Every structure is written in structure tokens, then in C-alpha cells.
Amino acid sequence: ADLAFEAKSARDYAWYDVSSFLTYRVLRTGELEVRVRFSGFDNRHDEWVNVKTSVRERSIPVEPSECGRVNVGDLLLCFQEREDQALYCDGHVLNIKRGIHDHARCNCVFLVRYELDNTEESLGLERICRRPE
Template identity: 60%
Template structure:
């Protein structure tokens, strides 16, 4: 899942740096385009302990950020205040603790509680746990995107995803005693196990074959239709995760 987005050639700011630049722009407006101001800010960023192990920031990168803010303002398509609030909310609610991807939902209650969000990759249409939200940007059409690091993956696999369509609260694994929570027509996250790959993909329940069983082991059969290719498969409860009730 490589992403060669041009944004990376311009800058890769930390969340603290984005927040400081946002606050500076709100306070000073177009004055932030001044070269001396940008040089001072870039020097402060580069010498910060938060930059250890990261590349230094140039004043041109800082100025470009403010130029983008100015363009958004001029086109009257600047929902950046709302976008930043949402981005900070996502970041604050998210954990940086990685877990094994394909069997991450088999962890302890504490493990599961710390992973709050999942995001859909545009490469394979599968959902992955979010380890952390790295950055955000507001597109010219007003849509918000965030750059995510998927849990268990390296930096090279970071990806920009649309907040509205590809970021959501983490799906919840089901216990055998909870099989009655799954209804025909429900959207579920299903573990797709193939010889070539193993992914978590969206699917809808099209039929259920209920069986009598105890609270320790579910023997019901769930017929699901995968959203990405409309193929159907009979699966067990342990391969399903339900969507949070909102």
C-alpha cells in the first residue's frame, strides 16, 4: 500500500506543528506569509525534541502551509476550523499501541479498548485498525482527509483516507452468546480468509441458519455477501464483527 502523494514532497508536519501553525494563522492571518516569520517558525520546529529522528523543516514548507490556508480563505471553502477540531478529536481518542493485524480482534479487553478507529484502504477495500492519525488536509471541495498509520504496518504504508467515507469507530468482535445480535440485513465486518490473502471486509448478512448452542460456542451459520465484489459465503460467528450501535 504505497502512497506517492505530492503532499509528502511539500511537508510532513507533526500534529503539534499543525496546531501551532493553525493558531498562528488565526492570530496573524496573512502576516504569517512573511519570510522571516516562516524562517523563525521552521527553526523552532526543527530544533524541537518532537523532531528527533525526523527531517528538518524548511521555511518554504512552512510558508506553503500558510499559502494553502490563504487560498482556502480566498475561495471561501475553508472549513479548516471544523476540520481541525475533528482531526484533534480523532487523534485524542486513538491509541498508538500496535497489535497484530489479522488476529487483532482476539486480544484482551484492554487491547481492544485502546484501538478506537479503523480505516479503509483504497488499495484493497479492506479495513485496518488505525495506530495513529498523522496529519490532516482539507481538499478544495471542502472534504476532510487524514493521513493514517495502520496498526502493524510501517511508514511506507501510510495512506490518505477520506474521513466521511473511510474512517469509522472500530468494529466489535462477537462472543458466542451474542449471536442473536446479528440480524439479516446487518452490515458486518467479516474476516475474509483466502489462500492468497486474509482481510477484514464489509459484508451484509443475507441469511442466518440458527442452531441451538450454549454460551461458550456458537454453531450458527451466517450467509454474507461481500460489498466489494458481491460474492457470498457461509461463515461462522467468530469471523464476524458487528458495527457499534450509534
């Protein structure tokens, strides 16, 4: 499979799936930014994003069978749903409460610390994605 990517928006600090890269530019600080096209979406969404900070290989869904590779301290992309918006943003696993289950569905409860505002939330596997490698 080909490398796929996600990019961090400087508007909301959330990660979004990238369809294609249109162009690049060098700020007079020497810092590299690329123009990205976002997945399944209008083209006023196009954004300049920093290459090193805001572009990375796409996050990976975790099957119930592999819920055991997610440990504490681990970095995850977490589906954060709040007062009317739902963003995918970084968080780290503070605690894991293992449940009894099988291949079909995971019922483990992961307590996550969101990186930005530092709030916390308890997520299930169905709402997180792991980092490659």
C-alpha cells in the same frame, strides 16, 4: 473506554485498525482526508483516507452468548480469506441458520453478501464483527 477506529484502504478497500492520526489535508474539491498510522505495522503503510467514507468507530467481536443480536440485513466486518490474501471487508447478512450451542462457542452459520464484488460466503461468529450501536 476511549473511542478506537478503523480505516478503509483505497488500495484494497479493506478496513484496518488505526493506531494514530498523523495529519490532515484538504483536496481542492474540499473533501477531507487524514493521514493514518496502521496498527502493529510499518510506516510506509501510512495512508491518506477520506474522513466520512473511510474512517469509522472500530468493529466489535461478538461473543457466542450474544450471537442473537446479529440479524439479517445487518452490516458486519467479515474476515474474508481467499486465494492467498485475507482481508477484513464489509458484508451484509442475507441469511442466518441457527445452531444449537452454549456460551463456549457459537456454531450458527451466517450467509454473507460482500459489498464490493457482491460475492457470497458462509461465515461463523468467529469470523465476523458487528458495528457499534
